[PDB]
Design a protein around this ligand. Structure first.
Ligand code: NDP
Ligand code: LIH
Length: 184
């Protein structure tokens, strides 16, 4: 199974000029950290998979993302960028790696953390998928977008354990946490 996690504006934007479209929302980052870091299985870590631009968009003080194995996708790089644990040239290759002995006993959950083309590839996964979507309830000028969610294929869950249902607000920006699950 794969999990994708994203924060999206009302106009489906995720990024602008290599940064977020909105000012930083600390508590949104805290939600992302909690969901991507937490494993129920003692000793294991979750794997975060991200594109190269997403990696370099994270402040160096937060790289690698603490408590998670960090894998970057790139076809141009020849080794992981400084601080990253792994580099793959495709999502299928990254998932192949999670099955091989160097990672198979270390990794619990797999989280896809952006950007656009990585989400798009993940959404063609034949196995089970969940989409953890933070709805940023404003329009923001964006140049990178999340793809459309097919509501004949996914369902919006009424709630999810450990995920707050209530509207959040930081810096005058309202947002909320949703979880979608691929149909059987
Ligand atoms: N709101 C949110 O939840 C999120 C926001 N962001 C924002 O989005 C933007 C970054 O995302 P985006 O611009 O889409 O870029 P990506 O992070 O997807 O980086 C694109 C680069 O990653 C590599 N790559 C991406 N997908 C694949 C793949 N499937 N297989 C192999 N290589 C791949 C390529 O590197 P190469 O050219 O080396 O081959 C590609 O040029 C920033 O503005 C960031 O702030 C990012 C993540 C989440
Ligand atoms: C991957 C990702 C980011 C990437 N950006 C940053 C991460 C962490 C620290 C940061 N600190 C300053 C600027 C940007 C940062 C932002 N928010 C996200 N939210 C949700 N839900 N899902 C995601 N995939 C997110």
């Amino acid at each position: 199974s794969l999990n994708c996690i994203v924060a999206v504006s009302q106009n489906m934007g995720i990024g602008k000029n290599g940064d977020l479209p909105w000012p930083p929302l600390r508590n949104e980052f805290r939600y992302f950290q909690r969901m991507t870091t937490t494993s129920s299985v003692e000793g294991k870590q979750n794997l975060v998979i991200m594109g190269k631009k997403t990696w370099f968009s994270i402040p160096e003080k937060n790289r690698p993302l603490k408590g998670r194995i960090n894998l970057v996708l790139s076809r141009e790089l020849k080794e992981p960028p400084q601080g990253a644990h792994f580099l793959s040239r495709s999502l299928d290759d990254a998932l192949k790696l999670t099955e091989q002995p160097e990672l198979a006993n270390k990794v619990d959950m797999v989280w896809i953390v952006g950007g656009s083309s990585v989400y798009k590839e993940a959404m063609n996964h034949p196995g089970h998928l969940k989409l953890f979507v933070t709805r940023i309830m404003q329009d923001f000028e964006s140049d990178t977008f999340f793809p459309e969610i097919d509501l004949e294929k996914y369902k919006l869950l009424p709630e999810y354990p450990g995920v707050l249902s209530d509207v959040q607000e930081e810096k005058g920006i309202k947002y909320k946490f949703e979880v979608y699950e691929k149909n059987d």
